[PDB]
Amino acid sequence: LLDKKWLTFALAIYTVFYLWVRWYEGVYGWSAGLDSFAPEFETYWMNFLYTEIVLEIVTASILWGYLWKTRDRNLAALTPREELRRNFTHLVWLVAYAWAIYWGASYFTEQDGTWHQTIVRDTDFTPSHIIEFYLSYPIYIITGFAAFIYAKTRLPFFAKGISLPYLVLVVGPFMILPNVGLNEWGHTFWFMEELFVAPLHYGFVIFGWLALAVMGTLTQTFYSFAQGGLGQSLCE
């Protein structure tokens, strides 16, 4: 069967979840969601933040544990067909990681961007934030680490060590999480206005470049694919 419809599920779950989140934040962006210290803002955003943090930590723990415990010990005695199936599964999880990267890094990021040029920042836990750096960022961090662990535990090409470009692609986007609070200091201290081309606002740019390791990731995955299933048909 080779590639199976897990790609459809991976696209659909993210699309439905993020569309629901977008509708939720469109409805509740104002009207219990404009004031930082409103009691309704508390019960509408702070509990959401705590719940999403707990759920993402639990999901990361269980995914890492299950996927590292189910590692294939006898990697040498692996049939080429099942190796190709595992390569397809790894590419499906790379699709999930790419989709999560897009949602976390463009839609909700730019989203905060507009959410900023419409009102005036009032806390470091504004609602647009709870949705982006407090939800989508853990989502794609978890997806990237899951893809890394799956490659390590299932693909002999990504065995025998740790791929540097792949590790960079998994960490840099995650490395945007310890900088989520970088600029915020170059703020209550440095940039005392609202901008984007701000210097302090570059700990996400220098590390937005780290996602460029995806191309090294793809070339390594292609080399993994073209081990036994290169042809025959290709190279002729």
Partner 1 sequence: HGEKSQAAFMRMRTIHWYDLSWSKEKVKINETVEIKGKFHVFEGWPETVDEPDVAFLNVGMPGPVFIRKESYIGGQLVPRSVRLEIGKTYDFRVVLKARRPGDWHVHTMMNVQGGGPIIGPGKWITVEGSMSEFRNPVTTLTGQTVDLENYNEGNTYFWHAFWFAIGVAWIGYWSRRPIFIPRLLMVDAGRADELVSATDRKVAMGFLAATILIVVMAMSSANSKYPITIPLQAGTMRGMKPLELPAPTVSVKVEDATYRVPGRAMRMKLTITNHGNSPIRLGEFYTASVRFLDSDVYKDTTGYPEDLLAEDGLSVSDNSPLAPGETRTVDVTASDAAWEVYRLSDIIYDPDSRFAGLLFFFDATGNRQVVQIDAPLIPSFM
Partner 2 sequence: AVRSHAEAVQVSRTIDWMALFVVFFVIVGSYHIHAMLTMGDWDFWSDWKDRRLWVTVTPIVLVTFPAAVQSYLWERYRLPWGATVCVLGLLLGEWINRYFNFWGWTYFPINFVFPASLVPGAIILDTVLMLSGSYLFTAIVGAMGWGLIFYPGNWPIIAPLHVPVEYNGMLMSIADIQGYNYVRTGTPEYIRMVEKGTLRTFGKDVAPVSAFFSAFMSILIYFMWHFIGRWFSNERFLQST
Binding residues for Cu(2+): 112, 116, 129, 183, 187, 201
Please report how close the Cβ of residue 117 comes to Cu ion at its closest, in angstroms: 12
Tell me the site size for partner 1, rule CB under 8 A. Answer: 23
- Residue 41 or residue 97: which is nearer to partner 2 going by CB? 97
For tokens 């190279």, name the residue. Answer: 235
Contact between 193 and partner 1 per CB under 8 A:
yes
Q: How far is it, in rounded angstroms, from Cα 154 to Cα 126?
A: 40
* Burial (0-12, 13-18, 19+ Cβ within 10 Å), 31: exposed
Residue range at the interface with Cu ion (CB under 5 A); choices 134-142, 172-180, 181-189, 228-236: 181-189
Find how far residue 60's CA is from the centre of its chain.
12
Pick from 7, 11, 34, 60 the residue near partner 1 by CB under 8 A: 34
From the list 89, 144, 107, the residue with the least C-alpha distance to 17 is 107
Contact between 111 and Cu ion per CB under 5 A:
no
Q: How far is it, in rounded angstroms, from Cα 72 to Cα 69?
A: 9
- Residue 67 or residue 89: which is nearer to partner 1 going by CB? 89
| Bind-site residues | 112, 116, 129, 183, 187, 201
| Nearest-10 crossing angle of helices 6-28, 80-102 | 10
Residues forming the site for partner 1 (CB under 8 A): 30, 34-38, 118-123, 192-194, 218-219, 222, 225-226, 230, 234-235
